[PDB]
Amino acid sequence: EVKLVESGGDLVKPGGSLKLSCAASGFSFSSHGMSWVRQTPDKRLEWVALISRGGSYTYYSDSVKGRFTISRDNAKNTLYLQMSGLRSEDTAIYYCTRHKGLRRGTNAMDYWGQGTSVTVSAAKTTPPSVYPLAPGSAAQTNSMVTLGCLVKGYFPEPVTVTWNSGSLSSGVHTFPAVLQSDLYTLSSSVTVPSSTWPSETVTCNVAHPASSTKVDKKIVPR
Amino acid sequence: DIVLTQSPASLAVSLGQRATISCRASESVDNYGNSFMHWYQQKPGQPPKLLIYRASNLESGIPVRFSGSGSRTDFTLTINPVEADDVATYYCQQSNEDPRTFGGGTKLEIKRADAAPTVSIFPPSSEQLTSGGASVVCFLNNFYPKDINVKWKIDGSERQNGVLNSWTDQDSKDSTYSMSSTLTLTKDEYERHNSYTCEATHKTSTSPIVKSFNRNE
């Protein structure tokens, strides 16, 4: 199984530094060029830097040249991005990517990690409050029931939400965060059969990595 | 650097029809008998996925309904036939010169039949109330088209202050949208009114779809 696992994303103050790592497994790492690509909050993809299979050739986008250093350790099967002089514009999800290894010129990026999130801001990390959304007390019982949880007042993005630790996967809608007085809020809904709740347990699992928060909120009838 | 321009910015297409997406470069990206333009698909919550490399080569594992063509400064990605899980943003990217650069992307949307939303309303949780705040949450699930207008009423009067709306992207199976609409007000304000209504007006019906509760049951 080809895997590229990024780590190191965090909230950093302007002017600050940060080091990202990407652990490559399941292929011959030294046989491929590698790149970092980032996705900014406007959802645009932006190429950041590349490194040749042995590391003697590197190249950077105009935006990061002189501030970032890409490097690799083939024995460790690891790709690095050292960042410095961070600014608002560097806020993005950073993806580790593998280049195809065809001859006769340059190559497309054929495998991509899941990404690691970096935010550059003077604002402080704020953990979310998590509130259960159970139907109103006068609510009508139908064959279907929709539950939810409201994740409020956190910074920076992201939070992740799962239901019953992933078991409840279909019938889930998790909405994009919205800014509210400079903190983020989102909500997630899950729809399940009325026979299954409150008979069997339904729990929303909320993680906010930047504050090391993990909350499991049980949805209980009012 | 090489500037890549994609058009159109978005394209809406019925299931089974052809979609053609254009990428133009500020200079030729040809060399050595090849053209170095590659195409990627990006779906929400997922990293980009390689579709086509070096202008026309289909990446292993990608379905044959995706094809690329073009040369020098002018390239096209074609999807034929378009299927429900093709909802995504598509990007071109050149590697003929460093620094490597991406196009701005083209968002593919699916045209389908109208569908009424399923609406659910939730009073502020007791837990939030003890914290001193009050959010009333409304979910409008599985509807089409995207631009439903949600309206809030409190004791029968339209209420706009404190309302924030958020949409998911189009569902990769049924091609519908979902959204949340959240009314946030002080606990004081929440407690001095009785009836709370969220209303969806949508031309899948002449009557609004309504969900309401009374804080006094």
Ligand SMILES: CC(=O)N[C@H]1[C@H](OC[C@H]2O[C@H](OP(=O)(O)O)[C@H](NC(C)=O)[C@@H](O)[C@@H]2O)O[C@H](CO)[C@@H](OP(=O)(O)O)[C@@H]1O
């Ligand atoms: C091959 C070429 O002309 N360009 C490729 C470029 O090469 C850089 C560099 O690669 C080797 O050095 P190390 O990787 O540092 O060992 C090579 N040495 C050899 C073959 O012994 C040098 O001669 C050469 O200058 O590297 C990038 C890799 O990212 C290539 O781009 P793609 O990955 O997209 O193909 C580029 O083709």
Ligand SMILES: [Cl-]
């Ligand atoms: Cl040849």
Ligand SMILES: [Cl-]
């Ligand atoms: Cl770019």
